Amino acid sequence: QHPSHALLKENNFTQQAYHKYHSRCLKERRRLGYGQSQEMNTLYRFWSFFLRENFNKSMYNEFRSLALEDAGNGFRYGLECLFRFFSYGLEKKFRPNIYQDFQDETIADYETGQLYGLEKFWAFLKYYKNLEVQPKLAEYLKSFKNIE
């Protein structure tokens, strides 16, 4: 199996294995450029699912930073995986710092003219079974009410 799947198997994550896998992913990105590495893409998906229960400040900051570099040049997959992590990760374990970040990246995504992040935020607030919202995102969400 591919490391992106084997490292998600229950109780099988190892540091030694993640380091080898992580390594070639960055080399492949550093070799082929933003949004051009299918191997790097497997790492975005691994991060998206892994951190939902398997959180790591180290991995999360990297995930976020690279996803935003890519998306700043038009390649959306990494950022799409990050919003999916935000929406489903916070449903499984609410972290206030990560909720604030979710707001921050949703606002930034909307103001670049996208709706993928805002819908994911709307989806979270709706299903999150239990929130204060930056009044700017508050108004953006009110206008989204005409869509979903």
Numbering used by the authors: 796 to 925, 929 to 946
Question: What does the study report here?
Answer:
La-related protein 1 (LARP1) has been uncovered as the mTORC1 RBP target that regulates the translation of TOP mRNAs through direct interaction. Among other target transcripts, LARP1 specifically binds TOP (terminal oligopyrimidine) mRNAs encoding all 80 ribosomal proteins in a TOR-dependent manner through its C-terminal region containing the DM15 module. To assess whether this uniquely repurposed fold is evolutionarily conserved, we crystallized and determined the structures of both fruit fly and zebrafish DM15 regions in the presence of a dinucleotide analog, m7GpppC, both to 2.3 Å resolution. Indeed, both orthologs adopt a structure similar to that of human DM15 with three tandem, helix-turn-helix repeats flanked by an additional short parallel N-terminal helix and an orthogonal C-terminal helix.
As in the human co-crystal structure, m7GpppC is bound near the C-terminus on the positively charged swath of both orthologs where the Watson-Crick faces of both the m7G and the +1C are recognized through specific hydrogen bonds. We previously showed that, like human DM15, fruit fly DM15 directly binds 5’ TOP mRNAs in vitro and in vivo. As compared to human DM15, fruit fly DM15 loses one net hydrogen bond between α4-α6, although the interface between α2-α4 gains a hydrogen bond. Strikingly, the N-terminal α1 in fruit fly DM15 unfolds at ~1.5 μs; the residues assigned to α1 are very dynamic after this time point. By the end of the production simulation, α1 had not refolded. There are two differences in this region in the fruit fly DM15 as compared to the vertebrate DM15 sequences: fruit fly has an alanine in position 801 (all numbering as in S1 Fig, based on human isoform 2 [NP_056130.2] for simplicity), although it is a glutamic acid in the other two organisms, and the α1-α2 loop of fruit fly DM15 has an asparagine substituted for glycine at position 807. A glutamic acid in human and zebrafish DM15, residue 801 forms a salt-bridge with K804 during portions of the human and zebrafish DM15 simulations; E801 in human and zebrafish DM15 also hydrogen bonds with the backbone of N796 during portions of the simulations. These interactions may contribute to the stability of α1 in human and zebrafish DM15 and are not possible in fruity fly DM15 because residue 801 is an alanine. N807 interacted with the backbone of both A801 and E805 during portions of the simulation, which would not be possible with G807 in the human and zebrafish structure. These interactions may contribute to the unfolding of fruit fly α1 by facilitating the stabilization of alternative states that culminate in the unfolding event.
